[PDB]
Amino acid sequence: QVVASNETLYQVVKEVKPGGLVQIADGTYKDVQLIVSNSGKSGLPITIKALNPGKVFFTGDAKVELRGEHLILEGIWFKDGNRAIQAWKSHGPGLVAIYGSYNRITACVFDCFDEANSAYITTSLTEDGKVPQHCRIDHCSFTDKITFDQVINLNNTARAIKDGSVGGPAMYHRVDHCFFSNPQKPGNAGGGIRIGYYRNDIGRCLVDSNLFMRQDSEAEIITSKSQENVYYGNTYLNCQGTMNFRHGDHQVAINNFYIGNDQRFGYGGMFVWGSRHVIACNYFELSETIKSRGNAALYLNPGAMASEHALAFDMLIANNAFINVNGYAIHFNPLDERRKEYCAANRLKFETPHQLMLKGNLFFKDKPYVYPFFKDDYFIAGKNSWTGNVALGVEKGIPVNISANRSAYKPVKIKDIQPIEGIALDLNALISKGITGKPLSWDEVRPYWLKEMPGTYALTARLSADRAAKFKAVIKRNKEH
Template identity: 30%
Template structure:
């Protein structure tokens, strides 16, 4: 009887032990299932009121930092982190355009896949660094929907840049950058011993007065020191509105850059291949409206391409002609004028301008080396004051299949046929009609409407 009782007790304990283990296992499985169902989203959102709060953060891919609306006076923002292509780190205004950086504020972008969105710098000036700096270690970073306006010191001889692009694969887009009245280039792409592949697109560059001295470019790509290095920077779909700082609106000082499909409206200056080789200026609109000293494209260096541009009522001559091809120094230093070799000028339309082509421009006691291998082909010239001026005839000059109207024809030019038609206010080839980009593509910040009007007078 006792043996049977003990067996019963042991059986009861074994049954409960098994049952408890089974329940425990079932509970563990349930916890695991619940854990698996919980979203593993660790992205963080920070809301800040000062640069000190930003500078103290350690940011991870996917994090977002929101700057509270208001007046941020004399704030030195250091935006650092390493995002990824799938999960960039974002610094954004609470309401785009309502974070106003004043006083001596500036911004430094340092890291990978960082995006700055919706800020506004105005009613201030920088005392130490440039206004916005992409550092040398930055890559795949972006400044977008941002305004820099009238950020000028009282002393107009003070030189600092409003945007400095170091690093690689960075982008400045849909910004408004207007009203620079002091010394220094507005935006600079800084080059070293490797290409940087930056993109500058869909920005509005507003009026800038003539400084009367060198150093007032709106964009400079490279420097004389690194001018034989390649940048591969693209500048496209931007508006340059009365950017008159100096003779060079865009100064190309490196190789393999592209200036594509931009509007230069009443700009007193030129897009200049100043140093370096193998760059391209194509599909742009130069609207001079007979404003004194408005210019087109100035060519220096080797293997430069000038295709499919529209140049209207360009009033400049010689170095500021619609297309000016320069003479060079005999033994040039990096900062001097290098010989034009193999310039390729095709399918441009030049309407109602003073001087369509100038060859050997700038010839003087030092600039004595004529261009070599200039090709001018398939261009259209309507009603110029002067079709072509030859100050020093290039070697291996090839002028062919061009058409002109309203002027005495020169060798290589035929009477204008019926290839062109007026479309959207612009003379265009019938076989390649396109709507001017600024008519239906957003340019500048989505929240800011600049006072701009582009009439063809």
């Protein structure tokens, strides 16, 4: 039914049946506490949507909880929030918290919501430990986030100091066609998306066709902290951060675009911990790279095998292109001094990346940047395997013989790569095709009803005066008195 107030919305959601449709009349729903406990059924979802998307605002001291299964939340604009700062935390539920499985949030806008620390959307465990699975977040816009924590956390365990061999279960979520552009916070402030917590967690989430444009929240654009997540066809445009395989082996990134096209800041880029990954058909063209990480497109972590800073080794790096990177194409030992400190403290064995299979990559420069393609301060003959690469335009920086024949450059065919269970992509086929398509634009990901890009930061790299003032107040209250 059509509802036009908070109270009527609360009532209709208590009664709605599988296949039901709740439409919210034009207006502002201030301090709205939408808790949806009922469930739809497979093929009979319950849809809660604006009657006219773009005309419904959830504001004030608001929250949404999707606790039932088979629910769809659509066409809501979250702005002008005022949740209690003492009542919300990073690593807690999001503004929208999804506790049930088979739920979808689509074509919603989150724009500088408030000053309370939390994600904008989470999947969250219930108190009895049940893990939501098979959820989708798509065609949503996340802009000008001025609070701590990620924009989205996808959770399969409760936060703990941890380290017990039993990880969280596979989630099988999808995040697609979303737009992220958010200002830099201080420190380890929470990024774009976190998936899982530690290396025994299984993710099996698909993150595809998103546009991260000045996603600058903190060092990590995405902190992927579970196994077997697949990142396909995302665009990272002028982002002050890197997309990271932070914990969890056997993750996949194929045909993403990492573009930096001005000199305003250092941009990234991928930072990779762990082993057994597939990193293929990605395109890196970065006009400036990140000083603090080591100035590179692709960073391969040194350290102790399978530790808290897991050594990057034994993986496939295939058919990628590094075009006019103002930095190393590949840095084989970033942050090595900090990592030796970690390994010494914990009495762990420090190692450097090896057993890498570098196949069919193009390394090309014709602009006067000063960096050789590679940095490997621990180079050992034979430790990695290079086949079918092409390198031309600057010295390699390591003693490896690579063809310089660009005309003869072709991506390699690959046929031995196992797909990820639950994700309907043919990894061999996609890798063997080489790099397809081009960077995504706002029109390709935007909510169907929204023509104008929201936010103040994406086009300008600066918050508007009023939002800047709120951001300063958040940062101040979160640091030492």
